[PDB]
Every structure is written in structure tokens, then in C-alpha cells.
Design a protein around this nucleic acid. Structure first.
Ligand SMILES: CCC[C@@H]1C[C@@H](C(=O)N[C@@H]([C@H]2O[C@H](SC)[C@H](O)[C@@H](O)[C@H]2O)[C@H](C)Cl)N(C)C1
Ligand SMILES: [Mg+2]
Ligand SMILES: [Mg+2]
Ligand SMILES: [Mg+2]
Ligand SMILES: [Mg+2]
Ligand SMILES: [Mg+2]
Ligand SMILES: [Mg+2]
Ligand SMILES: [Mg+2]
Ligand SMILES: [Mg+2]
Ligand SMILES: [Mg+2]
Ligand SMILES: [Mg+2]
Ligand SMILES: [Mg+2]
Ligand SMILES: [Mg+2]
Ligand SMILES: [Mg+2]
Ligand SMILES: [Mg+2]
Ligand SMILES: [Mg+2]
Ligand SMILES: [Mg+2]
Ligand SMILES: [Mg+2]
Ligand SMILES: [Mg+2]
Ligand SMILES: [Mg+2]
Ligand SMILES: [Mg+2]
Ligand SMILES: [Mg+2]
Ligand SMILES: [Mg+2]
Ligand SMILES: [Mg+2]
Ligand SMILES: [Mg+2]
Ligand SMILES: [Mg+2]
Ligand SMILES: [Mg+2]
Ligand SMILES: [Mg+2]
Ligand SMILES: [Mg+2]
Ligand SMILES: [Mg+2]
Ligand SMILES: [Mg+2]
Ligand SMILES: [Mg+2]
Ligand SMILES: [Mg+2]
Ligand SMILES: [Mg+2]
Ligand SMILES: [Mg+2]
Ligand SMILES: [Mg+2]
Ligand SMILES: [Mg+2]
Ligand SMILES: [Mg+2]
Ligand SMILES: [Mg+2]
Ligand SMILES: [Mg+2]
Ligand SMILES: [Mg+2]
Ligand SMILES: [Mg+2]
Lengths: 179, 23, 136, 78, 58
RNA sequence: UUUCCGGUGGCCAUAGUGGAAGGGAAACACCCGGUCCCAUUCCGAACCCGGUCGUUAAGCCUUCCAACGCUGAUGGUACUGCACGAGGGAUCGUGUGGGAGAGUAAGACGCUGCCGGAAU
RNA sequence: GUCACUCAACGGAUAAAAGGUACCCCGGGAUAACAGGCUGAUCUUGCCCGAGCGCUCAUAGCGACGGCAUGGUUUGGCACCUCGAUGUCGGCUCGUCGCAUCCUGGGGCUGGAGUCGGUCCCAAGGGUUGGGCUGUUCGCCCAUUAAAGCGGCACGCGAGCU
RNA sequence: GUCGCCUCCUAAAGGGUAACGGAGGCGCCCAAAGGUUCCCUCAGCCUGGUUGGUAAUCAGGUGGUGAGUGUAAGUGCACAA
RNA sequence: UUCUCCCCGAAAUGCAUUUAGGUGCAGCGUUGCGUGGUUCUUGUUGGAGGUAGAGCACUGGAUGGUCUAGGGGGCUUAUCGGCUUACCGAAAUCAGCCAAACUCCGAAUGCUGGCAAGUGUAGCGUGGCAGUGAGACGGCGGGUGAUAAGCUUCGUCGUCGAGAGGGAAACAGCCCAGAUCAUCAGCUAAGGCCCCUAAGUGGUGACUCAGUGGGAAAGGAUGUGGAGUUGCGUAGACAACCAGGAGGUUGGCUUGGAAGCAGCCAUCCUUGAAAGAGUGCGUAAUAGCUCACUGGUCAAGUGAUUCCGCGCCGAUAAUGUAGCG
């Protein structure tokens, strides 16, 4: 789904200007792409927070004077202790063009009670399409134990999402309990 | 001690702008 | 006890206690973490006490990671002695913790038992800490 | 008690750059005291026994690069 | 060139020696003393060096 | 004038490392000899000399590949000069100036001067 | 021109030199001993978490591993007043203050049946013995008592005594 | 315990900067380990080979500085110092 | 160490010292003569750097994963060799890290040149005369010490020293401000305006009920006001009141008793609108009261969770209230 974010132009740069913007419940953002210069905007803080709750969301940046622009938040500088978004990098995207993204990993398998499963990565590199961004990629490990290992070369990938990163590293590991 | 803590607390008064002799 | 195999210099200046965490502010090993919200010096005995608390609560399930190693030697002056006559010998091994540093990681355990185990472990540390997760 | 088994330091040697870029110097003026060739002698600059770099002629000091070496030159004054 | 009007509002006591020489260079001698300078970058730099000690107008 | 190429510099990876293909007119190069000048801590391998037969296989050169390496913004952040403020304290924040590193988008399969050769 | 120095306490008092002083003698609180001051490692008194012990049951009573503090009566750290003197240990005498309560007064919980207790909450009104040993403080012991409290006051108190 | 000299850190990106602060060195050595001229490239790794093995000596590939530098350490030096 | 006034006005640092409370030279004061913007501030334009920060390229330290040369223990049995490699595991590689004596990087400042403007009258040479060479505290950056000291030792700025006036209750070093004299004029700084005590018991809007204001920690808590995220809900939500609140099944290792409450466990099935091999009380052990849920009169909001502002407890010495003067 496409989340529409109202933005307005940013013309004051520096730590002081960003501090004032964040004190006005807003978020600084820079939107860069392929066929235009970087555009500096400021977004509503709470709307941006809700939109960035999900990961890899398709955003429609709406600036009053200009036309809407499609974007993906590539870098999100959040506060480490609190949760507030401090800065947004917005990579502009085309409707008829692929996008590289990082899709998330989880384990939903149920091994024998003694042995436990682990995930060895956070997000994985995936080439996919705009209107089809997979939420996550599941690896189900039920009854697979001992020293079994799972690498990135054989996963039930959805349609339209090829694999880009090196397929010679592990993403999940099942093993005995901790001794 | 009470005496030293009060000496170090006197620096928080209005007319001493966060500082005082001997802390 | 975590003590390095060897250190280049056994007498070192006190680590700086200024600034937010330089690195290791995001979970990288487990599914839940203890994140320090305050700075300080975390000794190896406190690390061990927290590790015992977590490991004993979670029992047999999952793994525990210690993201911080106490490789900083802190010297001790000879007892009842005046000042001078050189620096003391190392007595304590510390990790320099800054606000936002993930101290411990925990995985393979559901969220409520993980929360209780990390509450038990946090009550052993000398600084303030909080339970963090991977957005659920 | 005990004692300190350190305590010895050598005297200050006052090395470093003595004439910076664009400074007018006479022939024979020392531009930089240094150990080794952190700076190399360029055009109009000679190197001493203790690696001191001195002006071989009158002109203005400039710092630059010649091939792969970081050099000090003394460009003749116009 | 809008002929900056610079007036001294705080004293030079307990300020950095840089600030005191900046006040002297502006022609300011006392609190409340005023000078008229040309609108040139050096005088603006002097004003912003001691902005906690002076006020500027046009 | 131009094109290609042989030397000689400057920048010193945006230039390199790796891969694929192609080319030798003059030049280059391997190559063939060791009688002669000359040589190997043994060896005409190398250095040196006499040739230019054979060959573009390698060097060299032209083109293609972002693959490894290299270059790399904008914005933000850390830090910081000056002026302040907060906390019981480790320490923290703001105003006004300056402002990285990492990272991202991206660039990139070199740029350029002089001498010479062949053809034009 | 060159030579002769562990003149090494290395700008090198003489070519040439170790100690005792409680028999001692003639500026400094620039500097130590007592006391005050700061700090609070140590000490002390509490507390947080709760592994575990308590037949069962973390928390009646406890309380590993860790964490945070109080007080300022200990040993120290500092060297800030005093060296043209701030007399110091113990006791006697006279007290006065605190409460972190030993007795007596009131209460909650108990692994409180009763008689007795344990523990922590209030509470400083009054009380809180005489001897043996030792200069002692402290401590051990004897016979008691409702009890034989812990501390501060220049480790209260020598122009009050010893 | 120290006392003179040298190297590094503290030392806050010129120089300088203290403590009975943290590390080490020196009181030499070399007639070549000085001068000049010319030539050469290492350590490590892999493979093959009598004694010979991880490591003596030889051969091929790879390897740019991680070897070396009379002697501490730092700055340098592969254009090699 | 004895009269006066006028102008200027330090140092408590460096080096050396039979030196360390002394002295010499230098630094800082003054003054005669000489030279005059050479000094200083700001701007602008260059220069060298390796600190802050950051990073892991090197050197060390380090957590986990993948993989592995090689060591341990056993086996058929060892001259090999295989079964192990379920133990240890150098190195290689992936991910997250650490460093005063690490750096592929890298500021701000500071330092140093050119130029321009401004500028007190600054700077420099050379002579006469010095005093000083015990510093203190505060802000910022560090070493010693324990994340100590009104501690100690450096760098830098300020004040005191040698500085009065106003504020800080009093209070060298903190804040404002540098006293030529007179003034029974005015405006202000820091700080203040209910009274002491000059000026507002000022206007408007919020919050606190702790005398917080007018000291303190880990930690504990339905204090209070506000802002988000999320679950249930007139298909009727949560609390209260009426009936099913239990079958096989005293499921198991126990334990003369674990039948539902000793602990650990695969953590189901059923008459069925409905229930968990079991959550509290009870209890030598079983009974039982009663919880999650289903229908009913009623019925308009209830339950978590995050954050923010101001508060609560923790709180705790000795002459007398005594931590707003
Ligand atoms: C450990 C003791 C410390 C010192 C003792 C004290 C002191 O000087 N006391 C004196 C003492 O001498 C006589 S009384 C015998 C004088 O009368 C008295 O005032 C005092 O000066 C003697 C040395 Cl005892 N000082 C002031 C401090
Ligand atoms: Mg990182
Ligand atoms: Mg030489
Ligand atoms: Mg020499
Ligand atoms: Mg970049
Ligand atoms: Mg930037
Ligand atoms: Mg950058
Ligand atoms: Mg001497
Ligand atoms: Mg003599
Ligand atoms: Mg005498
Ligand atoms: Mg004194
Ligand atoms: Mg004392
Ligand atoms: Mg006194
Ligand atoms: Mg205390
Ligand atoms: Mg002192
Ligand atoms: Mg007297
Ligand atoms: Mg009481
Ligand atoms: Mg009484
Ligand atoms: Mg006494
Ligand atoms: Mg320096
Ligand atoms: Mg500096
Ligand atoms: Mg000094
Ligand atoms: Mg004067
Ligand atoms: Mg002296
Ligand atoms: Mg003198
Ligand atoms: Mg750093
Ligand atoms: Mg002195
Ligand atoms: Mg000093
Ligand atoms: Mg100071
Ligand atoms: Mg002092
Ligand atoms: Mg003064
Ligand atoms: Mg005054
Ligand atoms: Mg007054
Ligand atoms: Mg005056
Ligand atoms: Mg007025
Ligand atoms: Mg005011
Ligand atoms: Mg009045
Ligand atoms: Mg009113
Ligand atoms: Mg009012
Ligand atoms: Mg109060
Ligand atoms: Mg409090
Ligand atoms: Mg008052």
C-alpha cells in the first residue's frame, strides 16, 4: 500500500535548523533519485512515524507546489533511546522499474524441545517490484535438529523477487541446547 | 557531610550563575 | 569471569565516560536485548551476575550473548598508603558503557520469560538499562 | 612502600615546520626539522644530515607532491 | 553600505582578551558608547565576535 | 590536418587487479646466433655484441565488462570556537559560527604535454 | 693540535671528609604528632534484586551473586587554623544531647497452642549494679538486676582533681 | 627510589608543558656496518624434489611491503636508506 | 625602617643551582634616548598538522556464526587403517565491537605567512632602577588518587592577590561592574518588586497540594494533568448479582499423602450454550469455598502499553526550630 505524506520545502540547513524543525514536531528528509537533483523537505513527525512503522513502505511525498513523487525510505536515522525519527533518506522510484530492498527474517519452525533454532541475520538483500514488496521471508524449521545449517540459496522466495546477496552465508542455524 | 553539601549547594542560587568559590 | 588472555598495557588511563554509544546500538545476535540508557563502568563480576540471572531464568531454551567485554584494567593504590610512589597494580576489569549500548542479547525464548529474565539481569547492573526487542 | 620505575624523558627537540607555504626565505634558511623524510626535498630545497630541509635559494616556500613523494619547494621570487 | 551602528551594552571585564581588543578596534570605550562603521565584512566579523557584548543596527 | 603507433614526461588506482575479444604499415617486442667489445658470487638466463629469419603466442596496443579494488556527493549526525543553561553526581542540553568519519545515491575499464614513424 | 675526569649528585662547593646526641643549644603551622576542617577507600548503619534455605513454601526467620546509599564514633587520604605552645591516655567529678532502644510503655507478622520467644514498627519520660585481673579504653570472669544500651559534646570535662 | 643523555605516550592536530605519571633505551659499536659507482628485491604462502623433517639447498607460481634496518623507540626507507 | 601628593604599575613562571622559604640569568614593571604602525582585532586568501570524533586498513584486545589443518579420549583394536570427530580446536571467512602509547580517515580551534580595513597608542632597539621567582579559587581540556577531597600536578581563560561599589543571608577567588572629587538629578547591569527591603499582595494561560518550592541513590507506587499505540464493546464490553463452576482422570518420577496447588512435564480428548490432567484460599493426605468461560434484569464505556510535566516514598545525629536568610 502507498502511504501519502505531506511535505514542505526545507531551506534552512545545519544543526540549529534541524533542531528547530524537530522541536516543531517535524522530520528533515532528503529525496534523491536518478533524473533530478536532491530535494530537501520536512515532513510531519507523527505521520512519518506511522508510515515508517513498517519497513520498506512505498511513500508518496506530496509537496503543495510540485507534483507527487514516489519514494522508498532508504535510511532512517532514529533516536537510539527514544523512538523518534531524526532524518529520512528518500530514494525516488519509478513505477515500471525494479527496486533493491532489505526484507526481514523470522523463524516459525518448532524443533525438538532440547534443540533450539537461531537467526544469524537481520535483513537480506532482495530485488523486487514496487507494488509487490514482501513483508518478510519465512524459514520454517520443524523437526530439523543437530548441526543442520540453512544458507540463503534455497528459500521459498515469492514471485518477482530475485536474490542478489551472496548465497554462500548462513541465515538460520539449528543446534543442541546451550551447554 | 551536611556542611560540605550545603557549601556545594550554595552555588545553585540565582545570583551565583552556577558557580561559587571552593565549589 | 571475563579477563583478557593478555593486554598490551596493564596500567591505562581511565576510559572516557563522555558521549553516546559509538557502536553496537542495535540488536545483532539475539531477538531481545538489554540496552544501557546510562553510561558507566561495567565490571566483570556484574557481567557475570547478570549472565547467571538470565541463564538461570531461561533454563534450557535459547542462547545468551554478552556484547561487552571487560578488557580495561583499572589499577588500585596500595592500601593505607600515601599518594605517589607510582601507579597501582590492576584490580578490576571493566567495559566502558555508553547510553544506547546493547549489553546482553537473548534468543530462542518467548517474550514474557525473556522480559522477566532480563529484568532479573538488569537488577544486577550499576547503570540504568531497558528491555528492547526487534519491533516485536 | 614502593617506587616508580619510570621517570625518564628526553629533552624537547623542537622539530616541525619552521617556514610555511608562501613564506619568503633566504638561501640557507631552514624550512623544517624532521626525523626521516616525512617531507622530501623538492626544487630549490636541500636535505641535511639530520634530514633538515633548508632553502637552496631565495624565494617562497611551497608544499607539494612530486611523483609519489611529498616535497617542499622554494619557488624563486619573481 | 548601510553604516552599521554599534553600541556597547556589557562591560569588557572578565571577557577574553580577544573580545577586549575587538571592542577597542571598534572604537568602543564604555558601556553605552556608540560608533558608526561602514557595512564591510571586517566590521561585521568584529560585531559577531563580541555579539554578547554589543548591539548592532543600521 | 587527422588516424594509428613507438619513445619521453606530468597527475599517481576515476588510472589498478581480474576477464573476453581483436591488431601489428613504420616502430616495438619476443626470436636466431656468439666470431668480435663485454658478462655470470655456475649458466650468452641476465648484461653485451652481430642480425631481423620466423611470430603476433607473451610484452605492447585497441575495444567491451562494475566483477574485486579505487573515487564519491546532498542531507543528517558526532565533534567543536564563542555565549549560556541543567543535574546530587558520572555528565547533559541550547543559542551563534565552523563541521566530519561512516553510509547512501553515484562516478569509473584513465586524463594530458613533447619528440618521432607510417599513411593522410 | 691532541691528551688526562662513573668531576654519574653528569652547569662539574675542596686536590683531600663518616657518624651520635634522650646532655643537647640557638625559624616554620611553608611540615609531621593531638584536636578541629574536607573526603569517605576503609569502617558503620541501612536498603534494592531474589538464587537458594526453611518438610511443601523466595520474603516467619533467612538471603548467594550482584547493585545503591546513610552516618562521619574507626584506620586512613589531604595538609586548610594553631609550632612568639590549641596539654595528650585512662580514671574520678559534674553533666547535657542524639536515637541507631538495653529495661519499662504501645503495636503488626510469625514456622505466635500456653509459658517463653524471633522479627520490625512507634516510642528518649525515667532508669540503666557492685567487684577480681590489667595504667588502661577494650576484654575475660565472679555475684546480681527489670536492664547492666550505643554514641556526640577538643576520642566532653588537668586556670576541676589524679 | 631517583639525579646526565636518547625515543614514545600523557601533551588538549605548530613549538613548549608537570607529578615518587605510563613504557623502554644509552655511557657504544663498525677500516667497514664510512665514501662512490653499478646491479638486485624481500618476509610469508602453495606446489615438485636425496639425505632433509614446519624450517638448510634447488625449481615454478604467487606475494608489494606484513621482511630487513649494528643497537631502544618513533619518523622514514621497496625510487630503497 | 618615621611627611605628602601626581603618573605608571607587577610576579608568584622558565632554565640553572650543595638547589628547592636563597640566588643568578630570562619572562613580567618603570624610565631616558632612538625607530614609527613594524603590534593588536576583524575579514579574506594560503600553509603544516593527527587532537576531538570516527573507523577497523595495520598492531594488540574481543563476542557469536560458517568451515577447517591439528591435538584429546575411546572403540574393530592400533605397523597402518577405519568407526568416531557428537570434546578441544590454530588459522580462513561473515556479523556486531574496543584502544593514551592502534589509524584507511579526520575537524573546530590554535599556530604561522600575504593582503585589506579598523585601532588603543600599541610594537621594537638600546641604556638607568627594580620587585617577583610560597600563589588561591572558578569555567573549559587532561595526568595522580577510588568516577574522593576546599586533594595533587599540568594547559588555557577569568577573578582575587593588588579591587572598592551592587547581587549572592553572612561569605578573597562566583555574577554584574573597574571608585579623579562634589551632587538631597536621571537611565540602567547582575539581581529583584507580599513585609523585613527600593520596586507588582502586576495582567493573561497552564500545572503542583508535596510547604514540593525551600538537598540526595538504586529502587517502589491505581498521586495528578496531558499526549500517542493497541484489545474488547448496544452482534453488547469490564465489575456485581442468580444456574453448569465438573466427567475417564486418585495422567505420570516421587512422597506412609502430591487426587487441584511438592517441583518438572508430551502442557488432550468429553454431556456439550461451558471449562484449564488445575490458576488462589483449604490444607496430616483427600474434601471444599471459589477463579478463566457460558444464558438472564441492568448496562455506557472498560483493559493493557509507551511517553511527557509537576509531585510521593526511599530520607537517616548528637546545645535550639536549624537544608526559603
Ligand atoms: C600531641 C600533642 C599536641 C601538642 C600539645 C600542645 C602543647 O604544646 N602542649 C604543651 C603544654 O605545656 C604546658 S602543660 C604541660 C602549658 O601550660 C600548656 O598550656 C601547653 O602549652 C606541652 C607540650 Cl604538653 N600543642 C598545642 C599541640
Ligand atoms: Mg560498525
Ligand atoms: Mg648523512
Ligand atoms: Mg652523523
Ligand atoms: Mg563517501
Ligand atoms: Mg555534511
Ligand atoms: Mg563525508
Ligand atoms: Mg646538575
Ligand atoms: Mg673541585
Ligand atoms: Mg628553640
Ligand atoms: Mg598548613
Ligand atoms: Mg587530623
Ligand atoms: Mg580549632
Ligand atoms: Mg558520605
Ligand atoms: Mg597545597
Ligand atoms: Mg599568643
Ligand atoms: Mg526509632
Ligand atoms: Mg531524656
Ligand atoms: Mg578528651
Ligand atoms: Mg604538539
Ligand atoms: Mg595545541
Ligand atoms: Mg611547568
Ligand atoms: Mg593604572
Ligand atoms: Mg625558590
Ligand atoms: Mg632577577
Ligand atoms: Mg576517542
Ligand atoms: Mg615556585
Ligand atoms: Mg600553578
Ligand atoms: Mg585551575
Ligand atoms: Mg588546592
Ligand atoms: Mg584586581
Ligand atoms: Mg568586590
Ligand atoms: Mg550585604
Ligand atoms: Mg577609573
Ligand atoms: Mg527606571
Ligand atoms: Mg535584567
Ligand atoms: Mg516597600
Ligand atoms: Mg492576587
Ligand atoms: Mg502574582
Ligand atoms: Mg524542602
Ligand atoms: Mg529524590
Ligand atoms: Mg532569601
Amino acid at each position: 500500500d502507498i502511504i501519502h505524506l505531506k511535505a514542505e520545502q526545507r531551506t534552512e540547513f545545519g544543526k540549529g535548523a534541524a533542531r528547530r524543525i524537530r522541536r516543531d514536531d517535524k522530520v528533515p528528509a532528503v529525496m534523491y533519485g536518478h533524473d533530478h537533483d536532491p530535494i530537501h523537505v520536512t515532513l510531519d513527525g507523527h505521520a512519518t512515524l506511522l508510515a515508517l512503522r513498517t519497513e520498506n513502505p512505498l511513500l508518496s511525498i506530496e509537496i503543495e507546489g510540485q507534483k507527487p513523487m514516489l519514494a522508498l525510505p532508504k535510511d532512517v536515522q532514529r533516536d537510539v533511546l527514544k523512538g523518534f525519527v531524526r532524518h529520512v533518506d528518500l530514494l525516488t522510484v519509478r513505477r515500471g522499474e525494479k527496486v533493491d530492498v532489505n526484507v526481514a527474517l523470522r523463524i516459525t519452525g518448532e524443533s525438538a524441545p532440547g534443540t533450539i533454532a537461531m537467526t544469524e541475520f537481520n535483513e537480506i538483500e532482495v530485488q523486487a517490484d514496487l507494488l509487490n514488496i514482501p513483508e518478510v521471508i519465512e524459514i520454517d524449521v520443524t523437526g530439523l535438529e543437530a548441526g543442520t545449517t540453512i544458507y540463503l540459496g534455497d528459500l521459498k522466495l515469492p514471485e518477482g523477487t530475485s536474490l542478489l546477496g551472496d548465497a554462500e552465508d548462513v541465515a538460520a542455524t539449528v543446534a543442541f541446547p546451550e551447554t | 557531610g551536611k556542611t560540605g553539601r550545603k557549601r556545594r549547594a550554595r552555588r545553585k542560587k540565582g545570583a551565583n550563575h552556577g558557580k561559587r568559590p571552593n565549589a | 569471569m571475563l579477563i583478557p588472555r593478555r593486554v598490551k598495557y596493564r596500567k591505562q588511563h581511565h576510559p572516557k565516560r563522555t558521549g553516546a554509544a559509538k557502536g553496537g546500538t542495535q540488536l545483532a545476535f539475539g531477538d531481545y536485548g538489554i540496552q544501557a540508557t546510562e553510561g558507566g563502568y561495567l565490571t566483570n563480576r556484574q557481567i557475570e551476575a547478570a549472565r547467571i540471572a538470565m541463564t538461570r531464568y531461561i533454563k534450557r531454551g535459547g542462547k545468551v550473548w554478552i556484547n561487552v567485554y571487560p578488557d580495561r584494567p583499572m589499577t588500585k593504590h596500595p592500601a593505607e598508603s600515601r599518594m605517589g610512589s607510582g601507579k597501582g597494580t590492576p584490580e578490576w576489569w571493566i567495559a566502558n558503557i555508553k547510553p544506547g549500548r546493547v549489553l546482553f542479547e537473548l534468543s530462542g525464548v518467548p517474550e514474557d520469560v525473556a522480559r522477566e529474565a532480563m529484568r532479573l539481569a538488569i537488577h544486577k547492573l550499576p547503570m540504568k538499562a531497558r528491555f528492547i526487542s526487534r519491533e516485536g | 612502600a614502593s617506587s616508580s620505575r619510570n621517570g625518564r624523558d628526553s629533552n624537547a627537540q623542537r622539530l616541525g615546520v619552521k617556514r610555511f607555504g608562501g613564506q619568503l626565505v633566504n638561501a640557507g634558511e631552514i624550512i623544517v626539522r624532521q626525523r626521516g623524510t616525512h617531507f622530501h626535498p623538492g626544487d630549490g630545497v636541500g636535505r641535511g644530515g639530520d634530514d633538515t630541509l633548508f632553502a637552496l635559494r631565495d624565494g617562497n616556500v611551497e608544499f607539494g607532491t612530486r611523483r609519489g613523494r611529498r616535497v617542499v619547494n622554494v619557488t624563486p621570487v619573481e | 553600505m548601510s553604516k552599521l551602528k554599534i553600541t556597547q551594552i556589557k562591560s569588557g571585564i572578565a571577557t577574553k582578551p580577544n573580545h577586549r581588543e575587538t571592542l577597542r578596534s571598534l572604537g568602543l570605550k564604555r558601556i553605552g558608547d556608540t560608533v558608526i562603521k561602514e557595512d564591510r565584512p571586517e566590521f561585521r566579523g568584529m560585531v559577531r565576535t563580541v555579539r554578547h557584548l554589543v548591539t548592532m543596527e543600521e
